[PDB]
Amino acid sequence: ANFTCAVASGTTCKSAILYTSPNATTYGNLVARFNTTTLPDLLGANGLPDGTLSSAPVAANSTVKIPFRCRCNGDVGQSDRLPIYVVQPQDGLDAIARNVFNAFVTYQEIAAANNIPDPNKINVSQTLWIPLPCSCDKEEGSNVMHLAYSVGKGENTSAIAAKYGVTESTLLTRNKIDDPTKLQMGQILDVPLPVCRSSISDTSADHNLMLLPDGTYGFTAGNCIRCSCSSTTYQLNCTAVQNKGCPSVPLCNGTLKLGETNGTGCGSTTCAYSGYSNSSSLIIQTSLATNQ
Numbered sequence: 001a002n003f004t005c006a007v008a009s010g011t012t013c014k015s016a017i018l019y020t021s022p023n024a025t026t027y028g029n030l031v032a033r034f035n036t037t038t039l040p041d042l043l044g045a046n047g048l049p050d051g052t053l054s055s056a057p058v059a060a061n062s063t064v065k066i067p068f069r070c071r072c073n074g075d076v077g078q079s080d081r082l083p084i085y086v087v088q089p090q091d092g093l094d095a096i097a098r099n100v101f102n103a104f105v106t107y108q109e110i111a112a113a114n115n116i117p118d119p120n121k122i123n124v125s126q127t128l129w130i131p132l133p134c135s136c137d138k139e140e141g142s143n144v145m146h147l148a149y150s151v152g153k154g155e156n157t158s159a160i161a162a163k164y165g166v167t168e169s170t171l172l173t174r175n176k177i178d179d180p181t182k183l184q185m186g187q188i189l190d191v192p193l194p195v196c197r198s199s200i201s202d203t204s205a206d207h208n209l210m211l212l213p214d215g216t217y218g219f220t221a222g223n224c225i226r227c228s229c230s231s232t233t234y235q236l237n238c239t240a241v242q243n244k245g246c247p248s249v250p251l252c253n254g255t256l257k258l259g260e261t262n263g264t265g266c267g268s269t270t271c272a273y274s275g276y277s278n279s280s281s282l283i284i285q286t287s288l289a290t291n292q
């Protein structure tokens, strides 16, 4: 029982952990550690500039947002069979949870996830699925990107909620908090980040994956589309990337190209990204969006 999720089992989502690096590293090393995402999406998930190298620093005890695919079973959200940890010479399931994964999981959740019958015995070189806490669920019938937050000391629900642009209301109903007062340190919180709206269709492969809070960006459709989110509008801004193994992007009707707008204000209309499909070959779809 990590983060509650109530959507149909098998449903996948994009979620994240706010990861605290014990040691100094680089963004490149985080990518190798988690392998839940690509470097440019990790960079974009934190709002670093496009074309930043993997050697971008991560200071000791600094925090990096690490996106991953979440799978929901009946009741809870779990990171979808990633990340995969390889046991070193004298690891232990409890040390691994706490000192590698910030206590986002418990050793029991690890063992249960890998069918290990006595939490005390794991072999060198044994691989472990680490199921990070996540969802899935909507907030108020609005899409959100849940983020797993490890409460540092001196914090409170007021400050956190302002930090992420969330009402303190949703935080308390989503997280079981009797008396906020003083939040206990080390507590894991479900923080549903607001995200841009999109025109990405149900039928589309990336339908629940382009969930971008403010200031972040991401890539989709075999890296042929770039999507960015600003709170300025909260409408996903998509653009064609121009790798040249990439398919053409259709106009809307005729004459409106991706990102272009027709009309004036509020009643204006925009050629948006609505998804892609991959049977046979990569096809990108677009559709007119009304000003939201």
Ligand SMILES: CC(=O)N[C@@H]1[C@@H](O)[C@H](O[C@@H]2O[C@H](CO)[C@@H](O[C@@H]3O[C@H](CO)[C@@H](O)[C@H](O)[C@H]3NC(C)=O)[C@H](O)[C@H]2NC(C)=O)[C@@H](CO)O[C@H]1O
Pocket: 084, 113, 114, 115, 126, 127, 128, 129
């Ligand atoms: C059909 C066949 O023989 N294919 C081989 C693959 O099975 C094998 O992949 C390895 O599989 C084992 C189990 O499939 C993996 O270990 C499992 O890992 C999950 C988390 O990843 C963990 O929860 C399971 O408990 C754990 N089970 C076991 C038995 O350890 C292991 O990670 C895979 N190794 C790699 C490198 O992918 C590959 C590897 O040789 O060979 C195929 O021929």
